[PDB]
Amino acid sequence: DYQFPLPQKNSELWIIQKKTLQDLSSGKQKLDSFQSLESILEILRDSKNQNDEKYFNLKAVFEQLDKEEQTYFLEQFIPKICQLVLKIKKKQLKNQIPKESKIYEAAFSREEISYYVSCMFLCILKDQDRKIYKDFRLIYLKDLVQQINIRRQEKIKCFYEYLKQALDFSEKESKEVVIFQRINCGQLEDYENWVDKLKAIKLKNVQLTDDKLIEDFPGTLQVDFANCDIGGGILGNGLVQEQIRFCVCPEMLVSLLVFDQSMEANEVIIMKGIKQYSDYQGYSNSFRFVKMGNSKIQKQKRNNPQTILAIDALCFNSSDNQFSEVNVSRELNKSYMGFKQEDQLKTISTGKWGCGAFLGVFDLKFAIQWIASSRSNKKMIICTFQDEQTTKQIQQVFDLYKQKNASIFLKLVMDYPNSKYMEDYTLLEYLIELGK
Numbered sequence: 001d002y003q004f005p006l007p008q009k010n011s012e013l014w015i016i017q018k019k020t021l022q023d024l025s026s027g028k029q030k031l032d033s034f035q036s037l038e039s040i041l042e043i044l045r046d047s048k049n050q051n052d053e054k055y056f057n058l059k060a061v062f063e064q065l066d067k068e069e070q071t072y073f074l075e076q077f078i079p080k081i082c083q084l085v086l087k088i089k090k091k092q093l094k095n096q097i098p099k100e101s102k103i104y105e106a107a108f109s110r111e112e113i114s115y116y117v118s119c120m121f122l123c124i125l126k127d128q129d130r131k132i133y134k135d136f137r138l139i140y141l142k143d144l145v146q147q148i149n150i151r152r153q154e155k156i157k158c159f160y161e162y163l164k165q166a167l168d169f170s171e172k173e174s175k176e177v178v179i180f181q182r183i184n185c186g187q188l189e190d191y192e193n194w195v196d197k198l199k200a201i202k203l204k205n206v207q208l209t210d211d212k213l214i215e216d217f218p219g220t221l222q223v224d225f226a227n228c229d230i231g232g233g234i235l236g237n238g239l240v241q242e243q244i245r246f247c248v249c250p251e252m253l254v255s256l257l258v259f260d261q262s263m264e265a266n267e268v269i270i271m272k273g274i275k276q277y278s279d280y281q282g283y284s285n286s287f288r289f290v291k292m293g294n295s296k297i298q299k300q301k302r303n304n305p306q307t308i309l310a311i312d313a314l315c316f317n318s319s320d321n322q323f324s325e326v327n328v329s330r331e332l333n334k335s336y337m338g339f340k341q342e343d344q345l346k347t348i349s350t351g352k353w354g355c356g357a358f359l360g361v362f363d364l365k366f367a368i369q370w371i372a373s374s375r376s377n378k379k380m381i382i383c384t385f386q387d388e389q390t391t392k393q394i395q396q397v398f399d400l401y402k403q404k405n406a407s408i409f410l411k412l413v414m415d416y417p418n419s420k421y422m423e424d425y426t427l428l429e430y431l432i433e434l435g436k
Contacts, residue, residue, distance in 0.1 A: 003092035004134065004257050007085070007124050017044055017124065018086070025083040031074040034062055040078075045123045045137070056142035057152040061160065080167050081118040088115050095260040096182070098267075104182040106258040110273070111174040113251045114166035120253060121163060134256050138236050147285045151239045157289035158247040162277040165302075176305070178273040180255050185266045185337035191325035194332050198407035203370060205379040206398050210391045213383055214349045215245065215276065218304060220381065221345040223338075225353050226310040228262040230255045230269055239287050240357055245308070247289075248278045252308070265330060268338040269310035276301040307345060311338040313354025313365070322361055323417045328368065335372035348373050351383035363427035366394060367413050374406050393428040400435045 008014050020043050023029040031037050038055050047054075062073060096104040108116075119125050119135065126133035136159070139152045189197065214222050225241040232238050234246045234253070246252045251274050259269065279290040279298070292298050311334050316322055331354070339348050350369055354360035366382065373380040384391045401409055412434065416422060421430040 001097075002095040002260055004095055004125075004260060005092050005127050006088060006090055007119065008088070008091040010128070013046055016046075020044060021082040021086055024079045025086060027079060031078060033074075034059055034070075037074065037078060041123055053142040054137070055140050057149055057156060058136075058140045060149070060153050061156045077164070077167070081121060081163055084111075084115045084118040084166075085122060085124070087111075088119070093257050095258055097261055098182055098184045100184055101186040102184055104258075106180045106254075108178050108180075108254065109174065110176040110178055110251070111166070111169060113178050113254050114163065114169075116254050116257060117159065117163060117166070117250055121159065125257070134235065136235070143237075148237055151237060151285065151287065154287050154289050155234075155239070155243075155247055158278040158280075159250050161289065161291070162250040165277050176273060178251050178254070179271070180258055181270040181272070182259055182263075183268050183270060183337075183341060184264070185268060185333075188266055188333050189329065191329040194329055195407050195410060198371065198375065198410060199405070201375050201406040202403050203401055203406050203409060204374040204377065205402070206370060206373075206394070207379070207381045208384060208391050208394055208398070209381065210384045210386055210388055213385075214241075214351060214381075215248065215301075215306075217347070217349040217381055218300065218306060219345070220347040220349040221339070221342050221378075222306055222308050223348065223350040223353060224269075224308050224310040225356070225358075226263070226269070226312040228312040230259045230263070230310055239284050242310075244280060244283070244287065247287075248276050248280060249274045249308075250277065251275065255310075263310075263312055265334065266337060268334070268341065270341055271308045271310065273305045274308055275303065275305050307342055309338045309341060309348075311335060311353070313358045313360060315357075316354075316359045318359070321417075322364055323414065325414075328364075328414065331365070331368045332372060335369050336375055339369075339372050339378060340376040346377075347379045347381060348376075349381045349383070352385055361427070362390065363393075364413070366397075367409070367427070367431075371406050371410055390428075393426075393432070397428055397431045400432065 007017055020040060024040065038052060041055065042050065062070060065073060098104045121136055123135045123137045125135040139155055143149050224245050227242065231246055232242050234243045252271060255269065255271060263269065279292045281288050281290050292302055314327060314330060321327065352362050353365055353369065355362040355365050370380060382394060413427065416427050416430050419430065421433060425433060
């Protein structure tokens with residue numbers, strides 16, 4: 001098993017880092033400027049060269065604070081997160097690949113999670129043998145493209161907000177359990193096996209929403225449109241569905257420290273006990289951190305933990321046949337293996353999985369997820385992401401095919417590409433035409 005090294009693993013550097021951290025924590029060294037913070041980050045990173053562009057984005061967030069909160073940041077926040085790092089007892093974190101039909105479960109207390117996120121903030125998580133880092137050093141760094149700096153700053157703001165909150169945890173909240181599971185789901189079923197397994201399965205309920213998002217459905221199994229490397233570009237430039245979820249729920253960051261290796265076709269990830277610390281507006285280059293408000297629903301987002309399912313769709317290019325038996329069976333397996341987890345969460349909250357960055361056609365991905373949900377004997381919520389035309393089409397297909405045989409529905413789907421309808425009709429339009 002790979003062991004991701006924590007700072008204590010490098011015993012000689014840790015002598016230095018520990019003293020640095022302790023004098024900040026105790027107030028023996030008092031930071032008086034942002035430049036003094038740069039200096040301490042340089043020591044912790046064991047930098048060779050001075051280049052203030054290394055902290056450009058962190059400086060931007062700091063300079064947006066008011067003068068009282070700048071003082072707070074230097075004199076209270078940094079020292080307190082140094083103190084969290086000093087609470088770490090482990091020297092490394094296990095990165096296990098489970099055997100067939102087994103799980104690798106990594107449990108942590110909610111405060112422990114905060115210790116590791118503090119490591120990320122202070123740029124002390126790197127495996128020097130592998131030349132891999134799992135901290136905020138890239139996000140801090142000035143990019144040549146302005147919009148990429150703004151993405152990075154906005155991410156920083158979300159992580160900072162979480163760490164402020166984590167510093168204020170009650171003893172009860174601090175000892176709550178956060179669990180990460182890497183689940184090997186056993187043997188892949190091929191396309192003909194799928195057709196056979198579906199023969200007595202009836203399609204189940206779908207609820208459509210055009211104005212709510214996945215994270216708006218507490219109490220459901222909420223889907224992360226993952227990269228096979230959990231988190232994808234969260235510690236770089238990424239800022240679409242998966243990365244936004246990690247920004248609003250930064251406890252998810254610890255998944256990166258236990259799931260180094262890419263998910264296999266028959267693996268899924270579950271994260272349990274995850275709270276939401278930030279709100280947001282926009283998306284990608286328009287994403288901005290929004291402070292969580294104090295309504296009843298917003299307090300609930302902050303206080304009530306959720307379970308997330310991370311499943312990675314295929315990353316298609318334009319020449320791939322998304323309807324091939326091989327590619328359909330791949331997505332049926334990945335979705336169903338995910339959806340059937342957590343059998344007490346009888347509703348799946350999902351949407352355009354694989355159909356943004358990964359170039360999937362949503363008509364087919366809808367059909368595949370509905371088959372998977374149905375086989376798992378769960379209901380599904382589909383978020384259309386402010387796409388009224390898709391909502392209308394899916395509503396018609398749902399009304400026609402609800403409670404119909406799933407095996408035959410799959411076969412009708414798979415007839416589309418060779419049909420007389422392929423040229424002039426979308427998949428959804430063809431499914432409707434079959435009923436005319």
